[PDB]
Amino acid sequence: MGILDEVWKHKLILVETPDAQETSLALETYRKACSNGRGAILLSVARGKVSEGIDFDHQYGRTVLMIGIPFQYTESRILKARLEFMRENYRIRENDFLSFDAMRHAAQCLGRVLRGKDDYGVMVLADRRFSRKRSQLPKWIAQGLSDADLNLSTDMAISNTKQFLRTMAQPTDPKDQEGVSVWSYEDLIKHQNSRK
């Protein structure tokens, strides 16, 4: 269709490949492109080698596009047998277990964006089926997921992303985090005294 042509003008394209060495070299190239300001986009599999340990923080990870719920292949004999065994033994419904398995990998990929509290990012879940899975996401992500963002459009999400990045680009007031999110030794002692 020519969409990759449009992407190429703004960022380099790195793609995960079955070869582990090639994937590692692609990761190195992506990090170099992110560091030098050229801008890069990395395509990977939610249940692949990148998501099982490679972490994207600060300059490396800014936006995460989860294209669809990473559902397993339903028409698999092994998975069907496992689902039946779980239903019979642990009384776990097949749909519940499948949704758990997919949401677990989605959250795994989502959580590779932040290292400290000064890191920021936009996490877009692009699928109509995420709209009812908020209760299944981790607590710290569900709390940050607002009710107005449960079902958005592409243009409105782009506008929100622009506004959010512009807001997060400003200097933080030290007093706003002096003793409410970052604690010094004196603040820790005060917390211990108040608790005791």
Partner 1 sequence: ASLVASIVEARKKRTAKKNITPYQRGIIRSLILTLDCSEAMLEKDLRPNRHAMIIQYAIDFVHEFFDQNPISQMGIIIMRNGLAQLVSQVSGNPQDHIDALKSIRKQEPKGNPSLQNALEMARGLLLPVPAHCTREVLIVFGSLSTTDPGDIHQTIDSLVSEKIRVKVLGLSAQVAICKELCKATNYGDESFYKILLDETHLKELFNEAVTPLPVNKINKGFTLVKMGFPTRIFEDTPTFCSCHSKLVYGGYFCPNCHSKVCSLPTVCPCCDLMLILSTHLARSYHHLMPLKTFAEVPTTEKFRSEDCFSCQSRFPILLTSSRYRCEDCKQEFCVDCDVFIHEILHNCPGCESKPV
Partner 2 sequence: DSLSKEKLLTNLKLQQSLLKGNKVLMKVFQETVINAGLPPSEFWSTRIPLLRAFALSTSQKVGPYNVLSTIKPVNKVNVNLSREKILNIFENYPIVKKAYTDNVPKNFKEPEFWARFFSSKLFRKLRGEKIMQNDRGDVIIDRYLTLDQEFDRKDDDMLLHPVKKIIDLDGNIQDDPVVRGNRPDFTMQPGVDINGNSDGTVDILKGMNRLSEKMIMALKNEYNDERNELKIDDLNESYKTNYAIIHLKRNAHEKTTLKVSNQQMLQQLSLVMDNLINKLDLNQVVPNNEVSNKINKRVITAIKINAKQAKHNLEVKSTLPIDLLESCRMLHTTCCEFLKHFYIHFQSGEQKQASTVKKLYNHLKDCIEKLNELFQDVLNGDGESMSNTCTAYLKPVLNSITLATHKYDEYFNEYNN
Gaps in the chain after residue (C–N beyond 2.5 Å): none
State yes or no: residue 18 binds partner 2 (CB under 8 A). Answer: yes
Cα separation of 190 and 3, whole Å? 56
State yes or no: residue 78 binds partner 2 (CB under 8 A). Answer: yes
162 binds, among partner 1, partner 2, none (CB under 5 to 8 A by kind): partner 1
Among the listed residues 72, 75, 93, the one whose alpha carbon sits nearest the alpha carbon of residue 83:
93
Beta carbons within 10 angstroms of residue 110's beta carbon: 21
- The site for partner 1, by CB under 8 A, has a size of 16
- Binding to partner 2 (CB under 8 A) within 137-196 occurs at 174, 182
- Binding to partner 1 (CB under 8 A) within 5-24 occurs at 10-11
180 binds, among partner 2, partner 1, none (CB under 5 to 8 A by kind): none
Q: How, if at all, do strands 12-15 and 40-43 pair? A: parallel
Contacts with partner 1, residue ranges (CB under 8 A)? 10-11, 34-39, 58-59, 162, 165-166, 169-171
